[PDB]
Design a protein around this ligand. Structure first.
Ligand code: 0KX
Ligand code: MG
Ligand code: MG
Ligand code: MG
Length: 433
DNA sequence: TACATACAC
DNA sequence: TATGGTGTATGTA
């Protein structure tokens, strides 16, 4: 079963239009459309002489990148399929051959592929999703299970790269280069696994990943998809290609890299989001070769780091070694609620959040100098207000002391109107080096 | 240092 | 009735 690609957007708009949420989404779209219009004003003021001057600067840098292109590493991205929903499907048979999503009626974490055919997706509210699919089954989340399932897969992955990078519970990057070296001359004993009556996997990168996905399915009863490529950026993209329950390899030769990139929409790259797509689209840029073609223009319209990034993407480049993410930069907590307008209640809720945050800091023995409150009113508009201090702070009292005054300032500023808020949050940052 | 925006899960 | 939460990067002032 399923729905129509056009029936869907009609039901969403019909369900969402008029809400305070939609009002804020319009306010954001206008703010983006204006930011596009400003970029187009600059494109008109760009001279053919400037374009030539930049083109010569870009290609000089592009040659520096191209000559340092590293194809000697083998990078695997593993990504669980419909992760949360797959777990709930695994442990309740009644949800076999049925559309489901994990979450509440207010919000969904994810949805299984059956339900995806109706247009129900991650980050969608349940009440909207039920309009799209009345038979939809919303099952409450069990994060503790998901963490436990994750732990099972992370244990398998550690055989192939002990320094693998877990991006989240369902997701990881592996550098299997060093494993492939050792494995080249392994006996069938060291790469044989029994079915839950046994099987052997080859010496190749494709085979190594078939073993990983198999061992995962055997240990957890859940499928994963995987991507294989000479860098992280490519690997991530490939893992999505034959999803669910499939692989893809970009072989480690320059030509194959380029063939894959040629007509690849830039959205699919990790870091190109909804906005960057819409901005670049207005410059006629959709695919990665179009992104290469316009590289000069981009070096005049965007900041150094952004066009440097776009160039890496346009040449099929990316990170080839996994850096153990070291010290953290911020710790935070925030919560949504039904409207709170009484000041005394807002101080109480601030104090609560500061306590929870101090508790989380205690766990990692951390102290910081910057305390930042986050306030979101009933029309979904967001303010952050910060304050940095000489001496590091950490206790619930110390953090609350600072956040109290920031919140006071904001209540005082709108006076005599009360703050009609729907979410508050507190963040700490500026830990010592 | 302060604030907003964009992005990822 | 209803649109969640944590963390990093970065552009600007
Ligand atoms: N916005 C989001 C995105 C994901 N998640 C959770 C639910 C997902 O199952 C899990 C992993 O994210 P994900 O890999 O992007 N999606 P999911 O594994 O469900 O489907 P696939 O597209 O990978 O098959 O994080 C969330 O709670 N909020
Ligand atoms: Mg996934
Ligand atoms: Mg994921
Ligand atoms: Mg993207």
């Amino acid at each position: 079963e399923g729905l129509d690609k056009e029936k869907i957007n009609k039901i969403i708009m019909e369900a969402t239009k008029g809400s305070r949420f939609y009002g804020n989404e319009l306010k954001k779209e206008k703010q983006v459309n204006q930011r596009i219009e400003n970029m187009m004003q600059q494109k008109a003021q760009i001279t053919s002489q400037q374009l030539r001057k930049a083109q010569l600067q870009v290609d000089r840098f592009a040659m520096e990148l191209e000559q340092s292109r590293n194809l000697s590493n083998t990078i695997v991205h593993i990504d669980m399929d419909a992760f949360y929903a797959a777990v709930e499907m695994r442990d309740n048979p009644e949800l076999k051959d049925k559309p489901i999503a994990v979450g509440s009626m207010s919000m969904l974490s994810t949805s299984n592929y059956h339900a995806r055919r109706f247009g129900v997706r991650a980050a969608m509210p349940g009440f909207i999703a039920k309009r799209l699919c009345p038979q939809l089954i919303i099952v409450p989340p069990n994060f503790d299970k998901y963490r436990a399932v994750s732990k099972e897969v992370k244990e398998i992955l550690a055989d192939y790269d002990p320094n693998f990078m877990a991006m989240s519970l369902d997701e990881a990057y592996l550098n299997i280069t060093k494993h492939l070296e050792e494995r080249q001359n392994w006996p069938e004993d060291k790469r044989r696994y029994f079915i839950k009556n046994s099987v052997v996997f080859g010496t190749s990168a494709q085979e190594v990943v078939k073993e990983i996905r198999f061992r995962i399915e055997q240990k957890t009863t859940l499928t994963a998809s995987a991507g294989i490529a000479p860098n992280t950026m490519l690997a991530k993209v490939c893992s999505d290609k034959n999803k669910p329950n499939g692989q893809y390899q970009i072989l480690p030769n320059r030509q194959a890299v380029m063939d894959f990139i040629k007509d690849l929409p830039i959205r699919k790259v990790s870091g190109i989001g909804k906005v960057t797509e819409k901005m670049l689209k207005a410059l006629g840029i959709i695919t990665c070769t179009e992104l290469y073609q316009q590289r000069a223009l981009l070096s005049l319209l965007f900041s150094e780091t952004s066009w440097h990034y776009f160039l890496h993407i346009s040449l099929g480049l990316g990170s080839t070694h996994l850096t153990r993410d070291g010290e953290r930069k911020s710790m935070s907590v925030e919560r949504t609620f039904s409207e709170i307008n009484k000041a005394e209640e807002q101080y109480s809720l601030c104090q609560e959040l500061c306590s929870e945050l101090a508790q989380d800091l205690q766990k990692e023995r951390l102290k910081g100098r910057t305390v930042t409150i986050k306030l979101k009113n009933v029309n979904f508009e967001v303010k952050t207000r910060a304050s940095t201090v000489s001496s590091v702070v950490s206790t619930a009292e110390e953090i609350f002391a600072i956040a109290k005054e920031l919140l006071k300032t904001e209540i005082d500023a709108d006076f005599p109107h009360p703050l009609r808020l729907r979410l508050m949050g507190v963040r700490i940052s500026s830990f010592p080096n």
